[PDB]
Amino acid sequence: VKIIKKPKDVTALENATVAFEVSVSHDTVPVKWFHKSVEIKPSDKHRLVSERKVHKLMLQNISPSDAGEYTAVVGQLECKAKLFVETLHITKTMKNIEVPETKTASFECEVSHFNVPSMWLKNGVEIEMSEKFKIVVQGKLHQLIIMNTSTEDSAEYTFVCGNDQVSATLTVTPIMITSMLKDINAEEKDTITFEVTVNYEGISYKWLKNGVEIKSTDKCQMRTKKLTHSLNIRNVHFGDAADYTFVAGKATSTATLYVV
């Protein structure tokens, strides 16, 4: 009896199902399979199937323990093939971030394979995605986005990949109002400007008049150069006299406009 087809090497992922097959010239021929010098038996992991001239060994839910050389013995005839078992792992680490308050922070890591489930932890606890936490997957790149950061977002963040994991820390830096609002004594019809300076660029802020948020009309313009924020109020009259507040993250500053 002659071997017509020999088994081929197989590369597969952990937990995948794989097979090896030999085919022979004659129908009634018994076959044994060996791994690590031991004869393979039917089990929850091993299935042996014959169809006339074709003999198959099937392995379910493979583990790294299953990798290596398998041998098919047909009489005195013996042929070998190898299983390589690939495992999920992290291929690039994450960098610690420091981010100003209110700005967006992002962690990224790369994994070994496509179609890995995203799994992100904050101080050991699974993060449920929300308007705050955005999870993105781009092929083998996994990204965690944390929007509108606060000091409460400062923590250790972990990405889990199979049995592999990688951690990095986020540090959220508070906004500081370096140059505060000063009171303004103006005459009717004057154009005035409240100005503040902060320590970071591109932060979120709000202006308030007596506590109610202002929107920039032709009457109240809000401008922003580098770190300087301004509230310009044109053609000032008595209804413009009030308390004005600049709010940025947890940083606040109030002053008064007086109109003669």
Author numbering: 4 to 263
Quote the study that presented this structure, word for word.
For this, we examined the unique mSNP T2850I in the I-band domain of titin I10, as a paradigm of an alteration in a general component of the titin chain. Domain I10 does not support specific interactions or have any known specialized roles, so it does not constitute an a priori sensitive locus of the chain.
I19–I11 crystals were produced in (c) 0.1 M Tris HCl pH 8.5, 30% (w/v) PEG 4000, 0.2 M MgCl2; (d) 0.1 M Bis-Tris propane pH 8.5, 20% (w/v) PEG 3350, 0.2 M sodium acetate. Three molecular copies were obtained in two space groups that agreed in showing I9–I11 in an extended conformation. In I9–I11, the component domains follow a regular arrangement, where domains display relative torsion angles of 45°–68° and are connected by short, two-residue sequences (TL and PI, respectively). Here, domains interact directly through a limited number of contacts (section S2). Both I9–I10 and I10–I11 interfaces consist of a central hydrophobic residue contributed by the linker sequence (TL; PI), flanked by two polar interactions between loop residues from the neighbouring domains (inset). In addition, electrostatic potential maps of single domains in the I9–I11 tandem revealed that the N- and C-terminal poles of all domains are, respectively, positively and negatively charged. Residue T2850 is buried within the I10–I11 interface (burial fraction of side chain is 0.79 as calculated with FoldX).
